[PDB]
Design an enzyme around this catalytic site. Structure first.
Site, PDB file in Angstrom:
ATOM      1  N   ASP A 240      -7.185  -5.622  15.156  1.00  0.00           N
ATOM      2  CA  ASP A 240      -8.527  -5.966  14.710  1.00  0.00           C
ATOM      3  C   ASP A 240      -8.540  -6.968  13.548  1.00  0.00           C
ATOM      4  OD1 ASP A 240      -7.744  -4.565  12.494  1.00  0.00           O
ATOM      5  OD2 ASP A 240      -9.217  -2.954  12.717  1.00  0.00           O
TER       6      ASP A 240
ATOM      7  N   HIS B  76      -6.920  -6.792  10.730  1.00  0.00           N
ATOM      8  CA  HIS B  76      -6.683  -6.224   9.408  1.00  0.00           C
ATOM      9  C   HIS B  76      -5.303  -6.618   8.842  1.00  0.00           C
ATOM     10  CE1 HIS B  76      -4.596  -2.583  11.288  1.00  0.00           C
ATOM     11  NE2 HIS B  76      -3.812  -2.843  10.256  1.00  0.00           N
TER      12      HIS B  76
ATOM     13  N   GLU C 138      -9.199  -3.245   6.048  1.00  0.00           N
ATOM     14  CA  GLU C 138      -9.878  -3.064   7.329  1.00  0.00           C
ATOM     15  C   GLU C 138     -11.112  -3.979   7.422  1.00  0.00           C
ATOM     16  OE1 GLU C 138     -10.050   1.309   6.155  1.00  0.00           O
ATOM     17  OE2 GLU C 138      -9.555   1.594   8.255  1.00  0.00           O
TER      18      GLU C 138
ATOM     19  N   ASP D 119       0.809  -1.187   0.000  1.00  0.00           N
ATOM     20  CA  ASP D 119       0.000   0.000   0.000  1.00  0.00           C
ATOM     21  C   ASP D 119       0.849   1.246   0.000  1.00  0.00           C
ATOM     22  OD1 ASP D 119       0.808  -0.163   2.835  1.00  0.00           O
ATOM     23  OD2 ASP D 119      -0.991  -1.266   3.214  1.00  0.00           O
TER      24      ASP D 119
END
Lengths: 270, 262, 270, 271, 271, 266
Positions: E144, E146, E151, E75
């Protein structure tokens, strides 16, 4: 209203105000005297600080007097000088007792320096029961659902006792003793879940995302000694005041349900 | 048997007859006299209608008498006229007390018109004791596992008290009374024996929490796990959320109980 | 340390030894006499066999005496001849009581042949209270969480009572009546969950993979009458001793949490 | 925003309008012609009635045209008369197609009266592929998480096929056959879950407390054939629009999380 | 051994070393050339820093060469200058690429300042495919669950795309941008879950107590779009390397089970 | 019916009989010839013994013929003599192939003594495709949800491959025997799911938890069988004891599907 109560307000400050007002209201309605004083159980930690500040203010404006309020605190470390700034004796004096019209002899805190720690505990329990029991106990919860030093695995009927602090507690409390695990006292005296449960009324203050999972376990899951706050489900008159952030793990419907109880108990005509 | 019992029958009619027989069995076995009467706790709502019809029918056919039975009801609305058709007094009389050989004076229902409501609650709790406790309390549950006005979040040891109704129970809307008097979970738990009638698919999730899940104040009926002598009678539809093994387990208990040689 | 304790050891032999040493330790420190005897609750089944073997050896090496120890057993079948080799009177004598310096009038086992069974149970409860209660009850659990004949759906406050046996129990116990389910006595007398909970201290022995699920429900899941061992969450002074195999369904963090408690306990300076 | 979206609004009326506008938007931005038409998948049942009504008004008020929109419906019962009011053919014409500027030949619905039903299904899938796939599929869900006649236990990769209705579905759909459980046809033709997942975009409408448990299993729980809606977790471009009541079993944090995605998505300084 | 592997070591230092060794071993055994290069996918964040340190050391000692290694990163922020200290272009140069014998033209990082952002994503996926796919993709995971900017709620088959960052991503990354949430770029380009899982092999590095809940949801719980890493359960060739602290929410039996897989793998008489 | 089916019968003998008739039914309806044979995938372990005994009985009663049935098995040990009594070859021969009119050349079992094991796995995959795929694959499950050597943590889309046995399998299969073969060749979950249809046989209380995870819980690589949720045409047949961990409502749901599938008028 007829059930355990959950009061949700937006912020830490709002819940602190709700709590201080609630404590003031209970004492004022009781109307303590020298002969029949009000018996109050108190927490330390960051949680009750806002409540303490609000009560000091109400006391300055003569909306409340502590002259006939007898206090018992949850816990204290074993083997720390009462004058150490990180002692719970000091915590209470500097955050609360110095600023209100409380009688020095009406203040009760566990003596972590007693010769016989086992008797000191038994005597605290006798003293509480000598006054008729705590009328209102205010507390807070940890991210793992602990209250005081009643850590996960603490008996749901435990009493005042000696507590060796687990690794999680030494770590979390290490920031008060210059980031040093070796400087946090190894042991504490603490009231039990049973002690707290003996109170006629229990108020718990909870805030922040980091307590959300615990609030879920307190409210929605079964009674469970890994989340000792869940013991409150058995109490006849318990209230939890939570900020919005500590509700993130509750179901929408649970929030709506307890929000409606508050609305309905407002317009009830009684 | 020495454990909780779950009695499963195909239909609402079967469980009605079963519960009527159980009440009738308990009262006959005890043989109540004016000196030692039978103390019986009772529910309202649709669940026990069947049971009440059967109890009436057994009373006509002389299989049971209510002459020396003292009854206690769970609740009443505050401020409603006693003889209002929607009152709990009216429910009990119209569907039960008018059709049996019960004595007017042995009937106990909360007075929601008392001048002091708190004392009314206190006296009611004192009255039950003055008889030395309910012997058999019969109840029903809501789909959310509530027992009457002991609703989710009620303390798993509460007593008789003023309860304010939730908007859900309220739905005219502004005609309904805002408050009720109700016995507590603890009041019911004091009984020597508790029987709960559960029926229909909409009670299935509640039944699952009552039986398989842990003691939880969001499901009031789960307090029964702590009672010494609790029986649940359910039709098949209300078992749809139980495990096959739970059903077989409680069915086996019934057969072994039937054949225990006692 | 002030919580439930979970003592984990590698093998069934290690926990057997641990448990024997604990029992020996509590009796020796109390130092019982004829006027002040030690009151001991005991279990049957294959669970405690290793503990009994170790207690026998410790008795032979004069490291403990049972001369002033009073025992109460959990259960007995209704309608089995006392001397029948499968009765629990025989189990206890042959695996334990025959081999230690215990006085025979100090042994209490429920009489499943008593004319009034309901009264035998009331009397057993009265006899326990006559001594001031059990000081240490040792128990074992089943794969389904049962203790003794408190099977799933036994009340979490049950007392001593008549119990009709369920198929799973009859099937399991059928191995000792030559694999015939019909030779198994149908009913038994058993102490209740509340009866065990009345003890000052409870010690549970758990071994093997087939108890892993039950140990999980005991320690991590909420109080639940389907897993009657879970009631120990409410006890003031409970210890569970487990082999590694019985821990397989616990979380890593749970094992580490209770291991850390043990190490802290040893290093608390008390 | 590059994730699933959950759009939450107070009422059934709000979500119906929101869904209508979304459909209008996707069509208008595509700007279809006879050579390049928009391909739209549609459901029946009561969920999309609000959306249909709103789409009719938008049409009447010249904010959308259906001249170059080709539709494919999810399902139709086997052996029901095409012109009986209880058929999905009739449902679609009465609630929607009768009231908009759609071309008759651009309407596609499964033929429950075909000689060879298996071939009818295969032809349906080929016809969808012949236009380059569905661009937007609108669906609803049932209280048990079902979509179309893809009931619990339907394969997560199912295709268009013959479906034998369960008692539960017959009981539920009897509300559409005057409450008469025996009037409901025993069998249906239905697109599969896979068929739906082939769509470029999926929009799901959900309302009411009786769908709350299904929405939780759609959003928060793992992919599971008992809740066929949960299959959307595998879709590249899924949107769910829900009234408030249907969110009662979601965590507060789940609602807050998808609300914030909507907030961030709109204020992201991009095209 | 024919299953997912979970390699549990005591500390971050052990797992970093294990991961570096495993990368070198894959590249050395493939033995890449100009005509036949090794295609490697790479993460940023604190998780892979250890690995990067170890790889640099291995490289100086000629225990691995990057001359014929083509890299693709996960990314990059949108509208950040490539030179910006906190860009991912810079993170990678500063922590890795500057220190090894990699050819500059063999390095592929998403262009967050591209004019057509959609085309950029599309061209990124094309480039990956032009080389026959990624051979080993290395990643980490967030608390979480991700991975990258995939996400919660990201499609389990998502591709490379624009991602609007949510409140908790913005807050967590605010620490690198003056503790001011309004300085964190609002959007990013990110490879998808489908993009990562297209790789022949995936290696995930996990450490710390704050990742324990996510690892449990990765390993033990059903495939679920709220824990995007759980998608690895469908991959054919996935390895997770975890410190002891990240295993606290797993079952004792899970840890014992995967530890035994490693012993039996080591002692199997195959290589 | 267009969903997964769950067929529940009282006992192991009942489900073995049901599975056998289902296999004979699919074979007979296809009506195989030498030019268009029926392609059948098969299991080992104790589960299918019942089914194998019933299919032997059906074969002798001329109710089915295996002359034009090509079979594929799931696995075989690496570095065992095929003639070894504990090899997968010997299990199939002794428990099935010796007793039925199958053609020797129509039988396929992985060669765990191939010189290139990876090529052997690829070649097995190619052979399945060469026949146009498996039409029906029959399997069983373990207590932990595994399907033969596709064990917890296996890829929900695994293919034919070398598999290293765990301590549990080395221990549990030490009764049938340190001399245990450490590795095996096995088809993958993905391999099995390529089949037109899949039938799974589940028996006993010790598989109740696995059945619950197969049916009611989400797709999960710790319970290999759950992968069937993605298959287009899956059938599970189960005795009563293995349903003990299912909800009453799940049993009644699938029983009603079995009733409606009989009475559908198609």
């Amino acid at each position: 209203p007829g059930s355990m109560r959950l009061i949700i307000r937006p912020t830490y400050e709002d819940i602190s105000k709700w709590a201080a007002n609630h404590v003031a209201q209970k004492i004022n309605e009781f109307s303590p005297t020298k002969e029949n004083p009000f018996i109050l159980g108190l927490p330390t930690g960051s949680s009750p600080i806002g409540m303490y500040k609000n009560l000091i203010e109400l006391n300055k404006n003569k909306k409340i007097s502590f002259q006939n309020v007898i206090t018992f605190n949850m816990d204290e470390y074993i083997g720390i000088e009462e004058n150490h700034p990180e002692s719970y004796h000091s915590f209470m004096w500097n955050n609360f007792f110095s600023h209100i019209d409380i009688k020095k002899e009406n203040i009760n805190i566990l003596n972590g320096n007693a010769s016989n720690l086992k008797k000191e505990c038994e005597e605290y329990e006798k003293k509480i029961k000598s006054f008729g029991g705590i009328m209102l106990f205010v507390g807070g919860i940890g991210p793992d659902g602990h209250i005081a030093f009643n850590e996960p695995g603490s008996s749901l009927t435990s009493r005042t006792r000696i507590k060796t602090l687990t690794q999680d507690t030494i770590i979390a409390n290490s920031r008060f003793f210059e980031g040093d695990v070796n400087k946090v006292p190894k042991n504490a005296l603490t009231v039990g879940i049973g002690t707290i449960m003996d109170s006629q009324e229990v108020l718990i203050i909870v805030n922040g995302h980091n307590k959300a999972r615990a609030l879920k376990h307190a409210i929605e899951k079964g009674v469970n000694h890994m989340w000792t706050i869940s013991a409150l489900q058995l109490h006849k008159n318990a209230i939890i005041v939570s900020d919005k952030n500590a509700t993130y793990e509750l179901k929408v419907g649970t929030v709506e349900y307890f929000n409606d109880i508050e609305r309905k108990n407002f317009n009830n005509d009684l």
